[model samples]
Target chain A: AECSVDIQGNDQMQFNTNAITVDKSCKQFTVNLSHPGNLPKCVMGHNWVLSTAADMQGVVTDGMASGLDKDYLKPDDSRVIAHTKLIGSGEKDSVTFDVSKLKEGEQYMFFCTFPGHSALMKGTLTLK
Target chain B: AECSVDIQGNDQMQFNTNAITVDKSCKQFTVNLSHPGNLPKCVMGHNWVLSTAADMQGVVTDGMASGLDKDYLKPDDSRVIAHTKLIGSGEKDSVTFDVSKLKEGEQYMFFCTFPGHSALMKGTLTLK
Candidate 1:
């Protein structure tokens, strides 16, 4: 509760923020993703995935190839630092990760892997 | 085009119109679909498929089975009277059909065949 933020996914394949910083004092960070649009999951679904900027492309490709049943993520993908479930409009999901997993001077990124969404639905994640 | 209309799809998996009518003066009618949102293709994809309301379920079920490479529509599926290609944000597509395809007062429906989108991305069509 002390270390969390709300993230919104709209029908436009966008997240509200391009960068989010976690308080260094917090043990863990939390993100709650919500889709306020009326679209359904298959047509306009979204998820929150976290990884390093360098791993972004590989993460998205593997996730999409895995398909919806797997929540569009590669099985045991070591590149993934954290992720939330895929969701449709009026639906919500959340993901939490330990702060220790992140390191200083390194950059992280978040994006959706619903096939063609990564390019537009992405942002930066960093420790503050 | 001899006749045309503008339709929009957003991250919500919805089209701007449910029912569209072609004037008797036009030999064929066209729909130009657009996505104003910043989302990408795979996540919040949308399309317009036309068929009798009674055939809606069958069209969608079979189309999704075909997958995105096929634009999520059954190939030459007789039940489908007309359809447009699946599109992502900032993308647009169009389809044209002969006005003679209409049968007096029969009811018609239009929807996206993407897996979970049909339920919310649908509307009625009829000859006016």
Candidate 2:
């Protein structure tokens, strides 16, 4: 079964969960993200990006400095295995990435790259 | 000499130091804060708050929900030993508190209470 995950982003720069598991049978994984608050992206922007736990910091920092036009992310940085664009209140977006990009033993994590949101919007990914 | 300190709050949701030392001579301590960026508070709010490292999390979380009008802080929350109000880019604010509130050996910390900035905008405080 294809894994479909829904996440809620709020005005407070938080996601409901920091950890999620993916099924090995998933040839493709779909993530449906929504921002449920009243703030605009210019004020409380948020996005989802997946990478190795170790690469999360560098990617976030570089993206933040790149400015909002870049969606606070380095353009096509190889460290980003999968990602979604920035979204604001009441907006929704999704991304589907191939399962082969993930390895069972490697530590994979997902986080928002909207400047500081990664602090609480990050979580572990389990592929089994 | 009194330990007068200057700190930098960046657009990246980070502070330059994870720790600071206050002089024993400081009956009143001062922190000179600066934000050189161009973003406004509604776009990228930041603030400085001092508390025990353990209490920091709870304080910041409550403060953020209080809204920008409350300076992203809970009104008269005892957990906040000392704090500066929320600020945006090109803006600065400071706070001074009785040094007696600090004990030399305690693990105090300084962090920005902005929604997600605590992840990287936190550091330790030392009273000497």
Candidate 3:
């Protein structure tokens, strides 16, 4: 709704924008992930994953085994706040989570959990 | 084309077919790359690239500079036999090349040139 962010991923393993701000007035926050490149999801796919900065590595490590069909995420993982489906060129996905899930001072991270992607496809999320 | 091969690339940075054979009788051969996962192209994109095994590294290095807009390949590079557009999950692309371009005993390679993908996303192509 009012608390929403739009991000773009390209074939170069980068997100067009980093650092998102979630207004405290909004009850929920939404993330819209878009792929502007021409490649498909299997090759250079991208997704929006949310978790605590401390949990990001663990979530990513576990996601590798979960495989692509599961959006490179462990099934029923409690550490994940929200994530969008993996997408390729000309495609898009979105996810919404309650603002209450995020803590005011706790550092949060957003990234693409696809194998080898986190190295270049990560960003920080903050509550304003 | 009568001489064609179907290959699959998944979110795991892998190709289902590792080796391709071009029948000597065919004038040309076609390679079809399909992605069956749900990730988009920017994060998990895959493409079918062909070049001499010795030149593979060079091609990949130069291609990285070309960016995603060029499908991660150098424009008009003579070393490239054929290549499909980079694709994400649930997407597919194809390319065709003259069979004569491949020598009878020379070693050829096919791979995805996306940044860090070439390591695991490569295969051999042979003429039989």
Candidate 4:
């Protein structure tokens, strides 16, 4: 668990935590997201998205073009730095990103880009 | 089913009934959509959207832009003749429209516009 963290999303619009800390010494960090909700992917799905705070809106808006099979995120989008595959109904997925990607003085956010899951399903990520 | 029909939406992205008969004998009819899953509005929202089959794709396109803040629908769209409010886990809503809105030989459909909830989440409405 030294280079990774675990997160949970539920049937409700919530992530288990809103902040993630990465050790700068590590070359990469991992995000393991799980959905304990009973709803299926089309109904209530979840994913962990990482990008600059300024690009979150663009990433989510453009992500609309990708279908559910793609985990609702655009694979070729430059705005997205890292993201976990979509998960639902007791499912889980993981994603790892280079710790060097977290630049100083830049705001990085980790959130769910799933449609309608905006109000409280995101968090901030920082390298310490 | 009464002049007013009740439908249930669950975590599997489905409605309890796929087709409903709206008797011409009734001047007006009601549609009650219920969400019995544990998911909340942001995660697993549900709604009843009625429009011509041709307008289905367009309604969904604009609804995605409207975002969940506006109930995942464009307000006062001519294509959307009738729609119910968005509901979440253990929630319910209903909408009523005059029979005149539905034509005898035309195809009418009901569906949920929540982002990725297509295909199986929609059905037909017929005048019997």
Candidate 5:
């Protein structure tokens, strides 16, 4: 079976889905990101970035420093398990990673790394 | 000539159009409101209300007491020139008023009177 999820971000700085499940049967997991607003990326861009729940703040803090050119993510950052490219309205992106990277009974999170966005754009992910 | 404007409100407690112009040549003006988010009205509702810039605070203050049943506006309050019903995500509302009611050179403001929303959901309107 497929192990992928679809998430949406709008001009309002919100992600329609706040939680996601990673089906245990799949060897890989994918997250598809969509932006359904009219605003451009510079003003309100979105992406899907994955990491352990503890790494969220660090990633966001350093992502802001990385600037928008890198999709607001630090180049070659080891903490990031997977991520999609930053996208604007009417755009879409997706990211996939091996399910083996995630540990059972561990807390993981997915969020948009856009500046000032992680505060509200994050969601929990768990294997099921 | 047509004398109407469109504004958007979102879950982030923001209005897309911060300023509006009312052509002096028209007898009436209308404001079309739209919410493009997926949340419900109780969580994030919006409306369009018109009043003097100086009266914005008072209107907002009293509207909170009037409750959401009245569209978060004081019932029959003469200070409000016009207003639309409170709407939630994906909903719409509109308000039309006689242009003659607006003074040629007075400062007027348009805002959402939802509790705790006026602080960020207001804009300026002028006759041109």
Candidate 6:
């Protein structure tokens, strides 16, 4: 799909891909996240959270403190560049962000903000 | 069975029972924990963690930093009275602790130390 990518999160605490490349020509990019497993949101839930690679732990900590009602995210937190809704098995969610958010020299990473998940379920987002 | 209890944790981040009663006559009590959902330990893992109810958050925070290799628990943390090995779908673990460890009038809580799980997966243990 043009300017979009589909990522799968399984019950095994894994994402099908390790990196996403966005085309510079696209004004915006979409991340379509889906879970393909037999689990509930509270257990094997996942979300696509984008931030600077260095900001990953800080994002996970604040989300951990915020609880799940807010999709494990802090409301109006500027540190979060873009994020998708928390979803479980067979559920899907997507988020679209401005392509301009990708700046040169600053490495951006995409990770699941679910507590403990940031340790394993994460990847890098690149601009091309 | 007189000195033992069985608890089930599901993908919804819930324990089948909210309370566990330890028989006063039993010198030791055992907790048998099982997961009925098809989930990965890193995502939906659970363990029976016992500590003063007031210490629940503290225990969870330290466990969050410790990682799953240690069953999401801090090793030899004096605050931890007893804890079962972390387990996932179809996996089970048991823990035994001396009943004498229960202090009179002090409240004890059993919780899953997995990051974000303590929000919903917790219960109270009482001596009867």
Give the CAPRI rating of model 3: incorrect
Give candidate 6 misplaced runs (Cα > 4 Å).
B1-128
The value of fnat for model 4 is 0.05
Evaluated at residue B11, the lDDT of candidate 3 is: 68
Per-residue error for B27 in candidate 1, Å, reads 18
- Writing each residue's lDDT as its tens digit, candidate 3 over A1-128 gives 37887899887678987789898999988888899986677767889899999999999989976887898899999999999988988998889889998889999999888787787678899988
Q: In terms of docking quality, how is candidate 4 classified? A: incorrect
With a 3 Å backbone cut-off (N, CA, C), the pairs that clash in candidate 6 are none
Between candidates 4 and 6, which one is better according to TM-score?
6
* Collision pairs in model 1: A11-B11, A11-B12, A12-B11, A116-B42
Share of the reference A-B contacts seen in candidate 5: 0.00
Separate DockQ for every predicted complex: 0.12, 0.34, 0.16, 0.06, 0.04, 0.06
Per-candidate count of clashing residue pairs (backbone under 3 Å): 4, 2, 30, 0, 0, 0
Indicate the DockQ of the complex predicted as candidate 1.
0.12
The TM-score that candidate 5 achieves is 0.53
Pairs that clash in candidate 2: A18-A123, B18-B124
Against the native chain B, each candidate's TM-score is 0.90, 0.93, 0.94, 0.95, 0.95, 0.94
Docking class of 2: acceptable
C-alpha lDDT of residue A84 in model 3: 91
Residue B104 alpha-carbon offset, candidate 1, angstroms: 37
Model 1, B2-105: lDDT tens digits are: 47888887764567776676666777888898888655666567888899989998998788768788988878899998888888878889999987897877
Regions of candidate 2 where Cα sits further than 4 Å from its true position: A1-28, A34-45, A49-92, A97-111, A118-128
Q: Could you give me the TM-score of model 3 versus the true structure?
A: 0.56
Q: Write the per-residue lDDT of candidate 5 for residues B9-74, one digit (tens) a residue.
A: 875568998899888999989889999875566545788999999888888878866776787788
Candidate 6 lDDT tens digits, B1-128: 39998899876567999988887899999888899876578767888899998998889888876877888787888999998888988989899899998976789999988866776678898887
lDDT string for model 5 (A23-127, tens) is 889899888889998657765688889999999889987886687788889998999999999999899988889999988999999888875577678899998
Error of 6 at A2 (Å): 3.3
Residue B48, model 5: lDDT of: 91
Local lDDT at A91 for model 6:
95
Q: Name the candidate that leads on TM-score.
A: 2
